[PDB]
Amino acid sequence: QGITFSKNDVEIIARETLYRGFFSLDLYRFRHRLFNGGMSGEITREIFERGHAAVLLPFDPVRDEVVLVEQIRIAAYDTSESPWLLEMVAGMIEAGETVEDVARREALEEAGLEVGRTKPILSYLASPGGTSERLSILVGEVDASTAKGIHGLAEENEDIRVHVVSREQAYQWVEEGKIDNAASVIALQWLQLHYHNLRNEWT
């Protein structure tokens, strides 16, 4: 039957900026209905506010190939063998921009790729106990033979290497833990569940 309560059932009293820099950390102060029939007291939660993202799975349906991008993610350092990760094309959505416009711009800047047809995959909350970030994933039709080399915007300290693999190879890398960031895991699991119909639609 689904969830129990709606926005009618919670009041955000205030939000307090705990840190303001490139990103923000806010204290949300709120009350909400309880499953037992009552109202909570005032609850506070620290929430990391960093905007929202567009993610592109670049899929070549003729060749059954996936384009990955490699770059350092320093936050991965403490729990990973290397901070260089294999990821999906992705970037932050600015005010007034569409998910698909960001995906196309990032595909060109990060992988030198033009994108043909697109379809939505899924839009997800990265970690909603502590961050508001939502990421909207699209699959985009590409010619993987045009995906190669070193990209990224140097002026933003963005250094990116393109890798092309077969779809099955990419999914094996997920199973083995060689690809282990949420956006790429979600996109490539979706692709494993939908590739037959998608290849038929696009060929």
Query: Which residue ranges make up the annotated binding site?
Result: 46, 73, 90, 106, 110, 129, 156, 158
* Binding flag, residue 78, a copy of itself (CB under 8 A): yes
Reply yes or no on whether 133 is catalytic.
no
- Please say which residue, 91 or 140, places its beta carbon nearer to Mg ion: 91
Q: Which residues are annotated as a binding site for AMP?
A: 46, 73, 129, 156
Determine the distance from the C-alpha atom of residue 196 to the mean position of all C-alpha atoms in its chain, rounded to a whole number. 23
Distance CA 178, CA 201 (A): 30
Tokens 């901070």 belong to which residue? 83
* Binding flag, residue 86, a copy of itself (CB under 8 A): yes
- For the purposes of burial, counting CB atoms within 10 Å of the CB of 148, is it exposed (0-12), middle (13-18) or buried (19 or more)? middle
The binder of a copy of itself chosen from 100, 109, 143, 159 (CB under 8 A): 159
- Please say which residue, 116 or 153, places its beta carbon nearer to a copy of itself: 153
Q: Which residues are annotated as a binding site for Mg(2+)?
A: 90, 106, 110, 156, 158
Q: How far is the CB of 7 from Mg ion (least distance, A)?
A: 22
- Please say which residue, 10 or 108, places its beta carbon nearer to a copy of itself: 10
CA distances (Å), origin 166, targets 97, 169, 178: 31, 5, 15
The binder of Mg ion chosen from 90, 102, 170, 191 (CB under 5 A): 90
The binder of a copy of itself chosen from 132, 146, 166, 172 (CB under 8 A): 132
By beta-carbon distance, which residue lies closest to Mg ion? 91
Distance CA 100, CA 104 (A): 6
Q: How far is the CB of 152 from a copy of itself (least distance, A)?
A: 9
Q: Which of 49, 70, 87, 156 is catalytic?
A: 156
Distance CA 134, CA 93 (A): 10
Q: How far is the CB of 199 from a copy of itself (least distance, A)?
A: 18
Q: What are phi and psi of 146, to 5 degrees?
A: -95, 0
* Binding flag, residue 127, a copy of itself (CB under 8 A): yes
Catalytically active residues are 156
